[PDB]
């Protein structure tokens, strides 16, 4: 393990562990090397081989088949006190939080292309039976050259189910009012709420809510000029009653979502 990858600089650390840049010696593929201490792991599972692993490995393997807008698990290793994950690393890359900090509120054409790609990636997770539970700009990487978005960090995720969830360890300011009020939510509708928060974040320059009272107040004030069609989609995703929120199909069929740029076009017009 330590002789298959040349370790480089620390890219980040936090509730997820410590992530390093690295290079696979076999072919100079850029990788990211994520370390998670065993004692800090809350939810455990097992995959085919019946071996006991962190749930994050289970979820990553389920979504890592074929091409998608999800960062793929290439390999993993168990150590005495930790698990190590080998992940794809785009290059050059910037995460969506830093991108929005630097550029400010995004032009709607660009937010449409980005948001569309996030929708396709979350649809992919749900097709694979995986609920991410931590959709936010911090957990989205931009391949600056190809104009492609990539979802990262499944450490708060779960298997997708149709019954209620009563546990949550994602980001509170992206969690829905039914979680704040009652510690209960359903998977798809809670995801759509966080996607509303993300869309507002993109077109206004920051998330709409910081406090529990704002989250359950359900009043969306627009701090930037945003088209009426986009405002309507955002307010729909942020409906206080979960059953009033749109399905993923209703989001992608919304008039604000038509005529999305291709990824290549998005990089050339907006990123290069």
């Amino acid at each position: 393990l330590e002789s298959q990858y040349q370790v480089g600089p620390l890219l980040g650390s936090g509730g997820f562990g410590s992530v390093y840049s690295g290079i696979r010696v076999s072919d100079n593929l850029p990788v990211a090397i994520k370390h998670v201490e065993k004692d800090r792991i809350s939810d455990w599972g097992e995959l085919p081989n019946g071996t006991r692993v962190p749930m994050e490995v289970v979820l990553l393997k389920k979504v890592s088949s074929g091409f998608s807008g999800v960062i793929r698990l290439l390999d993993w290793f168990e150590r005495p006190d930790s698990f190590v994950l080998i992940l794809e690393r785009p290059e050059p890359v910037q995460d969506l939080f830093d991108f929005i900090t630097e550029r400010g509120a995004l032009q709607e054409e660009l937010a449409r292309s980005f948001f569309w790609q996030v929708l396709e990636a979350v649809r992919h997770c749900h097709n694979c039976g995986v609920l991410h539970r931590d959709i936010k700009d911090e957990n989205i990487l931009i391949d600056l050259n190809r104009g492609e978005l990539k979802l990262i960090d499944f450490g708060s995720g779960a298997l997708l189910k149709d019954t209620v969830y009563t546990d949550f360890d994602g980001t509170r300011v992206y969690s829905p009012p039914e979680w704040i009020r009652y510690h209960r939510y359903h998977g798809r509708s809670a995801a759509v709420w966080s996607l509303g928060i993300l869309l507002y974040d993109m077109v206004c320059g920051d998330i709409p809510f910081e406090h529990d009272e704002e989250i359950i107040g359900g009043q969306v004030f627009f701090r930037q000029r945003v088209s009426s069609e986009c405002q309507h989609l955002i307010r729909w995703c942020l409906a206080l009653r979960p059953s009033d929120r749109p399905t993923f199909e209703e989001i992608q069929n919304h008039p604000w979502m038509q005529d999305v740029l291709l990824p290549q076009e998005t990089a050339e017009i907006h990123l290069h």
Binding site: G14, F97, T101, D169, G170, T171, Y174, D206
Partner: peptide, 9 residues
């Protein structure tokens, strides 16, 4: 206005 990251949990 202060924009900040938010940790999980």
């Amino acid at each position: 206005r202060k924009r900040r990251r938010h940790p999980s949990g």
